PDB file of C-alpha atoms in Angstrom:
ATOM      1  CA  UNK A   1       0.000   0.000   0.000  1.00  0.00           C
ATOM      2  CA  UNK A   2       1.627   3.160  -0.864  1.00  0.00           C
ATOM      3  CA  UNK A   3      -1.275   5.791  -0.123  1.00  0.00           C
ATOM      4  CA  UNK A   4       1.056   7.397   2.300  1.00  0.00           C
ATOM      5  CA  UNK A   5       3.243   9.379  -0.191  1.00  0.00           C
ATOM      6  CA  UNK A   6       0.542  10.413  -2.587  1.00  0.00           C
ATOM      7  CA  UNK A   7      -1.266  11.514   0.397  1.00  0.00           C
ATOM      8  CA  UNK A   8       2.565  13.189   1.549  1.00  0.00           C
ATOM      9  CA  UNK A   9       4.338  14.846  -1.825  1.00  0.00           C
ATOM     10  CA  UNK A  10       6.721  16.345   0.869  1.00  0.00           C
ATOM     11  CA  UNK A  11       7.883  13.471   2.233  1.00  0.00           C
ATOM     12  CA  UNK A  12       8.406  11.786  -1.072  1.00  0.00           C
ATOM     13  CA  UNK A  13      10.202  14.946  -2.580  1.00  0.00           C
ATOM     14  CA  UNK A  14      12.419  14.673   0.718  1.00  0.00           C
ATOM     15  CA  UNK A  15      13.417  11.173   0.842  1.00  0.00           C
ATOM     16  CA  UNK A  16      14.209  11.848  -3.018  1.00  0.00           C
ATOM     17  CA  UNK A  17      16.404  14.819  -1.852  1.00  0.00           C
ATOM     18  CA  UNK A  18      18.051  12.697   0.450  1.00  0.00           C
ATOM     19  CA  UNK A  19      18.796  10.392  -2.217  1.00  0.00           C
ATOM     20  CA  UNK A  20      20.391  12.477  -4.269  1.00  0.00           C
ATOM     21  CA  UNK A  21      22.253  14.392  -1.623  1.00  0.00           C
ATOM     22  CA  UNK A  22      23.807  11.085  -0.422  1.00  0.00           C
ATOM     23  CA  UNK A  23      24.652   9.948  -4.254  1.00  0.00           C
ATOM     24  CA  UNK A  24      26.643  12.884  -5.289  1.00  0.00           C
ATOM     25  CA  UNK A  25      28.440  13.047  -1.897  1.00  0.00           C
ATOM     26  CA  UNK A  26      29.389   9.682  -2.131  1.00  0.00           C
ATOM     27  CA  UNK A  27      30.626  10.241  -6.093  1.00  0.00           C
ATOM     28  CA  UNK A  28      33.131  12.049  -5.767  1.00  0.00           C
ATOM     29  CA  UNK A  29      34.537   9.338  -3.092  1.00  0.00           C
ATOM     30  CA  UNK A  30      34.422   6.038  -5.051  1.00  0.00           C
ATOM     31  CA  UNK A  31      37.272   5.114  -7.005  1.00  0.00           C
ATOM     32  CA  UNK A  32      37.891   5.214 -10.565  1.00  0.00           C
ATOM     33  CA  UNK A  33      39.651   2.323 -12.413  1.00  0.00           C
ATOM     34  CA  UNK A  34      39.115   0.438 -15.986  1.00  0.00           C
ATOM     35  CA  UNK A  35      38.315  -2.727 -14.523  1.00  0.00           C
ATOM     36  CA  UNK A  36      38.062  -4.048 -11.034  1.00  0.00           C
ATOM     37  CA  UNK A  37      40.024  -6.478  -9.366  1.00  0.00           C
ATOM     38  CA  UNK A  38      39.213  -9.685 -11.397  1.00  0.00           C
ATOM     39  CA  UNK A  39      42.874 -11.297 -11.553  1.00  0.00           C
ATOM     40  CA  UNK A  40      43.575 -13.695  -8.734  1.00  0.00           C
ATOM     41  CA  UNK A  41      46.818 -11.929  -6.280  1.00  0.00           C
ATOM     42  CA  UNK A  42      49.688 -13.065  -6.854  1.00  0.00           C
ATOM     43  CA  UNK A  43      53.136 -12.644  -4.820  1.00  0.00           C
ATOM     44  CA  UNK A  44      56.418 -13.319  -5.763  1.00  0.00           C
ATOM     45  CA  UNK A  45      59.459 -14.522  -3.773  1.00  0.00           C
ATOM     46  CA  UNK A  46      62.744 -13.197  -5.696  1.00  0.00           C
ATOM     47  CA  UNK A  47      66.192 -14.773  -4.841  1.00  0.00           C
ATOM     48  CA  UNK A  48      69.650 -13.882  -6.223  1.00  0.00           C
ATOM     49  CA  UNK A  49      72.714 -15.886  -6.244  1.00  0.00           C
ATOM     50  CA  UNK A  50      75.681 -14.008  -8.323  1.00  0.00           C
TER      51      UNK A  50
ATOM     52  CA  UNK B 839      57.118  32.752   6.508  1.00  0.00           C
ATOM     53  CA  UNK B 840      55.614  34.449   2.937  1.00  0.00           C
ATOM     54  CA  UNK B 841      58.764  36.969   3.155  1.00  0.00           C
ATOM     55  CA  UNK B 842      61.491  34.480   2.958  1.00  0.00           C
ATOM     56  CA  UNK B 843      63.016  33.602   0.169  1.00  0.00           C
ATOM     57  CA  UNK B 844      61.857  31.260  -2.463  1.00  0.00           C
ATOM     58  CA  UNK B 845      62.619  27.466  -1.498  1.00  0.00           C
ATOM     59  CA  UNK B 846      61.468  27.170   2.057  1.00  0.00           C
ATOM     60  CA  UNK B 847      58.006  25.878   3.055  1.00  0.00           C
ATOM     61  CA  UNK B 848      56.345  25.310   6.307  1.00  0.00           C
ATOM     62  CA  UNK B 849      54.542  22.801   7.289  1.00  0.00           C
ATOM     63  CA  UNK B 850      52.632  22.481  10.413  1.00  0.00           C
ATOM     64  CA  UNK B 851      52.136  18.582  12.112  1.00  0.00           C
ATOM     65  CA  UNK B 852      51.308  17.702  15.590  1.00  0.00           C
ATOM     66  CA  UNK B 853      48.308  19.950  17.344  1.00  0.00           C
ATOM     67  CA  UNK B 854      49.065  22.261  14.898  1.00  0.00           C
ATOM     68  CA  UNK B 855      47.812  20.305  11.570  1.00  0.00           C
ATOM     69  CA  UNK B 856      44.821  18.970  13.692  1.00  0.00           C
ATOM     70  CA  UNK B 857      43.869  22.580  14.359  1.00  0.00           C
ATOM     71  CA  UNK B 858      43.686  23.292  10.783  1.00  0.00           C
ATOM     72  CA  UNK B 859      41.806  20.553   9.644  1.00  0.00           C
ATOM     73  CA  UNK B 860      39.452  20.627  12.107  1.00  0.00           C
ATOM     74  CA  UNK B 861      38.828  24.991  11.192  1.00  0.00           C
ATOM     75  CA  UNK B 862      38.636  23.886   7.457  1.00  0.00           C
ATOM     76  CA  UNK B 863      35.541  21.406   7.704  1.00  0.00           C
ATOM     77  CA  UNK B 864      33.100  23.672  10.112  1.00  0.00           C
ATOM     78  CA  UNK B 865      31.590  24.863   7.671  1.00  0.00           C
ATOM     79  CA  UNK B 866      30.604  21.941   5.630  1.00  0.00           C
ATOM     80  CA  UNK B 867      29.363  20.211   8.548  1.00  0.00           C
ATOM     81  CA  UNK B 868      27.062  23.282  10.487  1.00  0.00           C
ATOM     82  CA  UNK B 869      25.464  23.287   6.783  1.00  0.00           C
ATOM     83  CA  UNK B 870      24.868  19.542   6.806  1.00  0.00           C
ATOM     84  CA  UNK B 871      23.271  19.704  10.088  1.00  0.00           C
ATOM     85  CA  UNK B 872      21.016  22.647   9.003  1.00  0.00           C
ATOM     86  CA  UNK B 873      20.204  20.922   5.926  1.00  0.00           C
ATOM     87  CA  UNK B 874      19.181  17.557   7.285  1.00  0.00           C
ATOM     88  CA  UNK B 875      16.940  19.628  10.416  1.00  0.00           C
ATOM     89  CA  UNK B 876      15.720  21.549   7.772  1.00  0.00           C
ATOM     90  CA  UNK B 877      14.408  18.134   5.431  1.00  0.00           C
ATOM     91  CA  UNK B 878      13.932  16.314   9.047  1.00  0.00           C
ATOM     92  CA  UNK B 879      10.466  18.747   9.966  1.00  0.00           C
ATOM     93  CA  UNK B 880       9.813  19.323   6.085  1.00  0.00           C
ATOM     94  CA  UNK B 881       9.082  15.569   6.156  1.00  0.00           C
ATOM     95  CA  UNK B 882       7.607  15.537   9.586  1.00  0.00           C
ATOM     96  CA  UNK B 883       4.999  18.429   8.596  1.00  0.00           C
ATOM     97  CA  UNK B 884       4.136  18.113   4.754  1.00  0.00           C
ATOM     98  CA  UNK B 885       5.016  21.933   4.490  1.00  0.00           C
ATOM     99  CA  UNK B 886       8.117  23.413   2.819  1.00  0.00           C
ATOM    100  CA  UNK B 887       7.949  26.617   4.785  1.00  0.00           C
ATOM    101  CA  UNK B 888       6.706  25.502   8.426  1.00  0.00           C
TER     102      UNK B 888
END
């Protein structure tokens, strides 16, 4: 049942608002990068005898 | 420290740096707080201006 909000534009308008306040706050924030972090981690043990 | 010479640069650490920071972001968070009081009672009244 969703009465409420057509009944309430207001609160509806302000839960959009906070919405969109919290999206382009958090924008900025994430990181950027081509692709994520698909390839398994991998370390590497180096030894040297001249 | 802006009349000496070119080359030198202060930076300030310890209490000092804290200070700073913590002047910089008053601003951004008394607006915040008026912002969400202000949408808070908008939603809890169904009027913009009340």
């Amino acid at each position: 049942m969703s009465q409420f909000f057509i009944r309430r534009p207001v609160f509806a308008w302000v839960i959009a608002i906070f919405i969109i306040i919290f999206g382009l706050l958090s924008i900025p924030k994430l990181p950027i990068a081509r692709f994520p972090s698909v390839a398994p981690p991998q370390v590497n043990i180096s030894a040297t005898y001249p | 420290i802006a009349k000496l010479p070119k080359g030198i640069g202060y930076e300030w650490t310890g209490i000092s740096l804290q200070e700073k920071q913590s002047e910089s972001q008053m601003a951004f968070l008394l607006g915040l707080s008026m912002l969400v009081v202000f949408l808070v009672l908008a939603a809890l009244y169904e009027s913009w201006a009340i």
